[PDB]
Amino acid sequence: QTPIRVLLAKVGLDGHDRGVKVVARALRDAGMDVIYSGLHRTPEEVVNTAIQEDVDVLGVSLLSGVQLTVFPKIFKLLDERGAGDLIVIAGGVMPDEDAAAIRKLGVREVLLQDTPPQAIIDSIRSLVAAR
Amino acid sequence: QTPIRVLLAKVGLDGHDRGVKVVARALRDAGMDVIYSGLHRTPEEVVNTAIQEDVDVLGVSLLSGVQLTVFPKIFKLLDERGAGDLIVIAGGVMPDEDAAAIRKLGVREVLLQDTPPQAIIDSIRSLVAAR
Amino acid sequence: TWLEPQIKSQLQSERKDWEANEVGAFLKKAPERKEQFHTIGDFPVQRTYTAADIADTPLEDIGLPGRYPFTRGPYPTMYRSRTWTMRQIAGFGTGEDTNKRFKYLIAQGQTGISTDFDMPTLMGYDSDHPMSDGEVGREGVAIDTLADMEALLADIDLEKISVSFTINPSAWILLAMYVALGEKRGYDLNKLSGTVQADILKEYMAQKEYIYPIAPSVRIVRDIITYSAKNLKRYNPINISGYHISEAGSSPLQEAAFTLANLITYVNEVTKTGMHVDEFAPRLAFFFVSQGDFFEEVAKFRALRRCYAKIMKERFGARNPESMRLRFHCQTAAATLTKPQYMVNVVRTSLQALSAVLGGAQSLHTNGYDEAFAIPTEDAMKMALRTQQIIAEESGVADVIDPLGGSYYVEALTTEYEKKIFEILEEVEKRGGTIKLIEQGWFQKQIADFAYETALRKQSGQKPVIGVNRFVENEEDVKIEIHPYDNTTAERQISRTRRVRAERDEAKVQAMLDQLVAVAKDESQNLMPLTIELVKAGATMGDIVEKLKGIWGTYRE
Amino acid sequence: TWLEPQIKSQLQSERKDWEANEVGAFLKKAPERKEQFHTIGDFPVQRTYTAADIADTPLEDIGLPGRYPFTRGPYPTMYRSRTWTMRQIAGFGTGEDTNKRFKYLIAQGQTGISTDFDMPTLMGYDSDHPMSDGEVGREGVAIDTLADMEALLADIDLEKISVSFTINPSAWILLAMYVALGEKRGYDLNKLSGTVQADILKEYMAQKEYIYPIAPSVRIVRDIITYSAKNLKRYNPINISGYHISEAGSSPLQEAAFTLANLITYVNEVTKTGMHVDEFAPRLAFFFVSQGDFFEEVAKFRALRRCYAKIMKERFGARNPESMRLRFHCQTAAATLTKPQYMVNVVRTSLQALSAVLGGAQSLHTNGYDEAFAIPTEDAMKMALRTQQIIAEESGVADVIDPLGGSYYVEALTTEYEKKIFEILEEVEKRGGTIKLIEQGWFQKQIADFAYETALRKQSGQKPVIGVNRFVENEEDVKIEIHPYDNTTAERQISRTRRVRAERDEAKVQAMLDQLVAVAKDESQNLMPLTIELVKAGATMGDIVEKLKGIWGTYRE
Numbered sequence A, B: 001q002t003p004i005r006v007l008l009a010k011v012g013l014d015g016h017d018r019g020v021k022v023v024a025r026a027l028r029d030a031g032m033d034v035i036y037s038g039l040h041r042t043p044e045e046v047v048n049t050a051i052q053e054d055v056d057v058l059g060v061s062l063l064s065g066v067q068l069t070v071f072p073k074i075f076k077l078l079d080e081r082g083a084g085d086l087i088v089i090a091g092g093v094m095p096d097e098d099a100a101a102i103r104k105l106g107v108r109e110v111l112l113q114d115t116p117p118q119a120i121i122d123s124i125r126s127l128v129a130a131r
Numbered sequence C, D: 001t002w003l004e005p006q007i008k009s010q011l012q013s014e015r016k017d018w019e020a021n022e023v024g025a026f027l028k029k030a031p032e033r034k035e036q037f038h039t040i041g042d043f044p045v046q047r048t049y050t051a052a053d054i055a056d057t058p059l060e061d062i063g064l065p066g067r068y069p070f071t072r073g074p075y076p077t078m079y080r081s082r083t084w085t086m087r088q089i090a091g092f093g094t095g096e097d098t099n100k101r102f103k104y105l106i107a108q109g110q111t112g113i114s115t116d117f118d119m120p121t122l123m124g125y126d127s128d129h130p131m132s133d134g135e136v137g138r139e140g141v142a143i144d145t146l147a148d149m150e151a152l153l154a155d156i157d158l159e160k161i162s163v164s165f166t167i168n169p170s171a172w173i174l175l176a177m178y179v180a181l182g183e184k185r186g187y188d189l190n191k192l193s194g195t196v197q198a199d200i201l202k203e204y205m206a207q208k209e210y211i212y213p214i215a216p217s218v219r220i221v222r223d224i225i226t227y228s229a230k231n232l233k234r235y236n237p238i239n240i241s242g243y244h245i246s247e248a249g250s251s252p253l254q255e256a257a258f259t260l261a262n263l264i265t266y267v268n269e270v271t272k273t274g275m276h277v278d279e280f281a282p283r284l285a286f287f288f289v290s291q292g293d294f295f296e297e298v299a300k301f302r303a304l305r306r307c308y309a310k311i312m313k314e315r316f317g318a319r320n321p322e323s324m325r326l327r328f329h330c331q332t333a334a335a336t337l338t339k340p341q342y343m344v345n346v347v348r349t350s351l352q353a354l355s356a357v358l359g360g361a362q363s364l365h366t367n368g369y370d371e372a373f374a375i376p377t378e379d380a381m382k383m384a385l386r387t388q389q390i391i392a393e394e395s396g397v398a399d400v401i402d403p404l405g406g407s408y409y410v411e412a413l414t415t416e417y418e419k420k421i422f423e424i425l426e427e428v429e430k431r432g433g434t435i436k437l438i439e440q441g442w443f444q445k446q447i448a449d450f451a452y453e454t455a456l457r458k459q460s461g462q463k464p465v466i467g468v469n470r471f472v473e474n475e476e477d478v479k480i481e482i483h484p485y486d487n488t489t490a491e492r493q494i495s496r497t498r499r500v501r502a503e504r505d506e507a508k509v510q511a512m513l514d515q516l517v518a519v520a521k522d523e524s525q526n527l528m529p530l531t532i533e534l535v536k537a538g539a540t541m542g543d544i545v546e547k548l549k550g551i552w553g554t555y556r557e
């Protein structure tokens, strides 16, 4: 019955963290166990942490415009380690068609700029309950 | 060798006269004989004045959006009185296609909003010389 | 005196030093663009203003908002309590057409209704009059009958929203229709908030909408004013206007001063009836432009409020503080907006909207980016409302009253405007009054001179106009949605006017028109009560207007 | 004291009266929206400000522009002599790509060049490094070699236009390339006007672009500063930045104060070399945001100039007046702009541009209406330039210096910011300095708290955001042109980098890298001369960056 374990990640050279720090505080305050990957992590580093830390959800904050390169790499590593049942969500900033293209890859939710933190809390609890 | 005789007109309910008063002063100062029809004149009143006053150019300032109704009426009256050789010019404000449609009716020049007064002086002297 | 003379001396000595040391050295490195800079309204400006420059203006002339002379605002709470009315002009086709736009504008966040009328309506003609041909519902809404106003204001709670009518020589007819509508609807007349522009003096001077000669036309304004004072507690019978004077080509000084000249004429005409200033002055209102010179326009608005307070108190002997507080509607300067690079108008209108807010306007219309092309689209009006809503909600300017108060420059310019305004008002009186000067074409000649100098300055490039004489582009891909004219408007409108005339009691309407001539023949009687009965009975504006031309004649310049 | 105490008493007595009479009566009719109003930066604001509110601020602290403490502006002539630089950011693909945009921006009226770099370049990596994958020329231009800079600045007269580089931990490499380019071109180095952002303290605090630990990274900033002071007379070696602190989620007070905290650290590091403050302080420069609170942002800019003057004179003992005059580049707040109803950003950016101009900025970037979508299009940048050009040429605000000077509100808020800034600067010193507090994450925790409170205020609707929590629309027809990424950028860029490495004297470059380690091992020596020889010799940024990681290591939070 343990709290929802969320890994909030930053992938590539992206140094945008205002949004990710906002989400992190929102979830910790909502009673979740929150792990922040830190800046400048590789997809392999991020995937390894999600598994090692046995998180329920892997949340990727992207503002660098690398989503279409990053997400296929993440899934390729998750399939390899038998971790395809991990809930992968995204946030940040990207075109609508990019949001669509990543959902088609297996991303369960894409909550972009202006998403109120309560909507993020709600979606996570909703995704964890569905599984 | 007499000065260029210009009739500046206002047709219909149009009370916009800032532009027409600017043109009038510009032409008088350029050495032209300028007649101003005054506001709220009919096309028949305007045509009669152009003929009675034996003007070289009939200048219609329009800002009321009636150009497509007014101009056919003016030409119909000018053809009747054997005054088709009268130079008819227009100014004011109208869509580009309206400017085009009146030129197709027989209007020799259309000098709309922002036209510097020197360009108006020049075009008139140019049109009078051409005939 | 508020400034310690030991400090005023220090300031003046220090500046003279700075003009020869720091300023002198820099002007060698790189001189200024002009030997003397001026506002757009031709007032010379200093490099900088210090407290010394405003030492001769007592602090009482600045003071507090909602306290005499009201330089800082007519209300003590201003926008911290109630935001200015976001009141956008709407007008085209028939009543039904403009009613659809009212509803759109309300859904987009407008808090007040503004209505612009077509030329026949403005000029006092019915839609089927020969002078109306090709002009019905084109430049604004067509109103011939009370039936059209019912279509216009359909599903609009007149007791819950204010309704403005941009109507002038035929304003009394539209006010009679409004009253008749309010009665029909079972509303309390004293709860009806609204305005009719009505100011005829500015029509002779600038807007050019007139029916009758000056004298009978002023008497109508007077009847509108006296009727409203006694019957419509929450109604604004006039907007003494400067907007049109500016837009006709005037300077901000001519705008301010000529509007005040018109106010004086009106107050004298109303008080001549034995009506005390305090019975109507609280309900008088104004309409000004917010032009391009950001600081000059703010100074002008504050100067107008101060001048108005002083005139009402000192010249008219008003004792009610509301008689001295100037309330005004503002519209951004349409004459500053361009056909080339039209989206750039959004920037121009933002600054002008801000000047109006900093200026303490009660009501504001922001122009559409499509100003130089046609009457606005929904998107253009939506953008004009978003502009206001950003200033009101995101900028913070609404939370501190008269934030520019104390500014050495704004205070000195406010004071310069005041003195220059009084100086003009004095000449008008010395030259024989407003009416005589309107008859001599004195106001109009001054406006025309400024308009011509503006045109020459645009031509030389001395007055920068972006897209016109600066950063000019050969734009080949101009995509703009234009508001279209519905060619069924005339047919649709005449159909209703013809029906109203057919359905009515012809004998009773004709008799009431003969009674109207008798009421008009007595300069002491009010035209309002009978015009209310006429419109109710099925009389058209044309029926009323034409009947009165028989005894009054028509005006021409 | 400048205010006569007999008048200060009158003002305070009169206001207390007005609060109970006019204010008391109106609050009954209609109360205010809030019990206490505040700026966006959480400073409480009064209903109105009078001369009494500013009586405790001496007139010397206001004074005159181009005279100490420079509250009114760093120059005595400001915009009447020279307009602010209209300097728009450009950066994407290869040098050639961004060079085309420079030329477009210049043709549209930009007067200064600004360059934004991609992530590999910002992070110190060459385009073919594994960390660079999918990031080459995406978020800005790719610079690996001096060859790329030649492509970047092709057909650009570096002696006739100023060139800004938004470069940080690898700023010294780009400055070495700029110097090498200037020499190659036969230019006089002392005639090169430009800037490298270089400020690393704000990178740890907010922008997050770092390579090495704090200590060696500050030494690089110091080497940039000392080299420029002795070799580049017209060059700005740093822009001590507040923009990123604000954009990371700070308040205007945290922005102002944390930037000044960083300045103090830098001055101490440079003077420690025995370089007198007056040898470099005149050439120091800053970078601030122009946020949404119109008046607060102006107050903040004037307060920063005053605080800076006082620090340089009193704390550093500067004797050259130029050492006390704060010069700053300004960018409008990108964080205020929206994805929904994006064209409304034009209004937001107009007001923010005006705050920068009224604030006395030396250089200005206005954001594009497409800010929340992607790096800008030509049209979006064109609109941003037209915005500046309208303010400069049509508004008149450029003709009177510090027009808001004297404003009771702006003056009181300027003074409130000053005191609150000094109070923060004092705590930083008491807590052990900037570096220690950066190591404790103290600055970052304060920024994060404001950022979170902003997010919660947006969520509740307490902070109005038009299009987001106010006047929300279900826009289905969103048409926006988006700047695209050229997928040949990586291939094209690596091709050149590989060629530069192939064509060069490998032995000489490797030997020069070993010399660089020896220069870096001596904290007293400057890194600039040898980095200039390296870039000339065909060294890449990666060659230089990687070699130094071997002795310095890398930083991580």
Ligand code: B12
Pocket: A013, A014, A015, A016, A017, A018, A019, A020, A022, A023, A058, A059, A060, A061, A062, A063, A064, A065, A089, A090, A091, A092, A093, A110, A111, A112, A113, A114, A115, A116, A117, A120, D091, D116, D117, D118, D119, D122, D139, D140, D166, D206, D207, D208, D209, D243, D244, D247, D248, D249, D334, D335, D337, D370, D371, D372, D373, D374, D375, D376, D455
């Ligand atoms: C603030 C900002 C910055 C700050 C960053 C401060 C910081 N430490 O974070 C500064 C000024 C330093 C900056 C720098 C740069 N920026 Co920037 N920046 C922005 C800006 C204006 C706002 C982003 C922001 O913080 N918004 C507020 C926060 C609260 O929202 P958020 O991040 O969107 O998060 C919300 C949601 O997305 C969601 N959420 C977020 N993460 C997650 C995760 C999960 C799993 C979930 C479910 C939800 C969720 O909840 C949050 C709360 O509502 C944007 C434009 C924009 N509108 O996004 C550009 C933008 C992101 N930046 C951009 C660029 C290009 C840069 C630079 C690369 C410029 C350069 N060449 O130097 C640098 C990069 C610096 C670096 N080291 O990476 C571009 C990106 C282009 C693109 N992707 O197509 C943008 C779009 C601006 C533009 N139009 O050019 N920037």
Ligand code: B12
Pocket: B013, B014, B015, B016, B017, B018, B019, B020, B022, B023, B058, B059, B060, B061, B062, B063, B064, B065, B089, B090, B091, B092, B093, B110, B111, B112, B113, B114, B115, B116, B117, B120, C091, C116, C117, C118, C119, C122, C139, C140, C166, C206, C207, C208, C209, C243, C244, C247, C248, C249, C334, C335, C337, C370, C371, C372, C373, C374, C375, C376, C455
């Ligand atoms: C100023 C103005 C007014 C002033 C008029 C003052 C006056 N006495 O003239 C006021 C505020 C009173 C006003 C009122 C109205 N207006 Co108006 N007004 C404008 C505005 C902003 C500028 C016109 C202007 O004077 N420009 C400056 C002068 C110098 O330029 P100009 O007239 O274009 O003249 C130049 C050239 O055209 C040329 N020129 C002019 N005439 C001639 C003649 C010849 C032969 C030649 C060769 C050259 C030439 O040289 C001149 C110098 O460069 C325009 C928008 C616009 N950009 O045109 C709207 C506009 C013309 N008005 C409009 C409307 C609808 C009205 C009203 C009907 C609103 C209402 N329903 O009440 C009223 C009508 C009043 C009336 N009695 O007719 C619309 C017209 C719609 C359309 N045609 O599609 C416009 C386009 C605004 C809008 N977007 O709604 N208005």
Ligand SMILES: C[C@H](O)CC(=O)SCCNC(=O)CCNC(=O)[C@H](O)C(C)(C)COP(=O)(O)OP(=O)(O)OC[C@H]1O[C@@H](n2cnc3c(N)ncnc32)[C@H](O)[C@@H]1OP(=O)(O)O
Pocket: C075, C077, C078, C079, C080, C081, C082, C085, C087, C089, C112, C114, C115, C116, C162, C164, C165, C166, C193, C194, C195, C197, C234, C236, C238, C239, C243, C285, C286, C287, C327, C328, C329, C331, C362, C363, C365, D026, D029, D030
């Ligand atoms: C041809 C071209 O298009 C140019 C044209 O000609 S188009 C012209 C279009 N004209 C217009 O739009 C004119 C509009 N004019 C008006 O609305 C009025 O005559 C006006 C100038 C007096 C302003 O009125 P309005 O917008 O209602 O604002 P205002 O009267 O201040 O506020 C309405 C109520 O709130 C109250 N109020 C406002 N601020 C308050 C405050 N801060 N605290 C307590 N009450 C407050 C007022 O007292 C008033 O109450 P009342 O109805 O009981 O008197």
Ligand SMILES: C[C@H](O)CC(=O)SCCNC(=O)CCNC(=O)[C@H](O)C(C)(C)COP(=O)(O)OP(=O)(O)OC[C@H]1O[C@@H](n2cnc3c(N)ncnc32)[C@H](O)[C@@H]1OP(=O)(O)O
Pocket: C026, C029, C030, D075, D077, D078, D079, D080, D081, D082, D085, D087, D089, D112, D114, D115, D116, D162, D164, D165, D166, D193, D194, D195, D197, D234, D236, D238, D239, D243, D285, D286, D287, D327, D328, D329, D331, D362, D363, D365
């Ligand atoms: C990630 C996000 O995108 C955020 C980012 O990080 S993007 C950051 C982009 N950064 C920038 O654009 C920074 C730009 N910075 C600069 O240009 C400078 O460092 C600066 C702040 C000092 C301003 O410099 P600049 O624009 O050249 O203006 P300024 O120095 O005032 O004027 C240039 C010359 O005119 C002179 N001048 C200006 N006004 C004058 C006047 N009124 N009278 C006489 N001379 C005057 C100056 O003295 C100077 O002469 P000099 O070259 O002989 O010293």
Ligand SMILES: C[C@H]1O[C@@H](n2cnc3c(N)ncnc32)[C@H](O)[C@@H]1O
Pocket: C089, C090, C091, C092, C116, C139, C140, C141, C334, C367, C368, C371, C375, C376
């Ligand atoms: C002269 C002023 O007239 C206004 N204008 C005139 N008619 C209308 C209308 N029907 N709809 C909206 N605005 C109108 C324009 O906004 C311009 O600013």
Ligand SMILES: C[C@H]1O[C@@H](n2cnc3c(N)ncnc32)[C@H](O)[C@@H]1O
Pocket: D089, D090, D091, D092, D116, D139, D140, D141, D334, D367, D368, D371, D375, D376
């Ligand atoms: C965070 C800031 O980065 C700016 N920005 C970043 N990269 C570019 C670029 N390549 N071109 C123009 N603007 C850019 C945006 O204007 C934003 O305001």
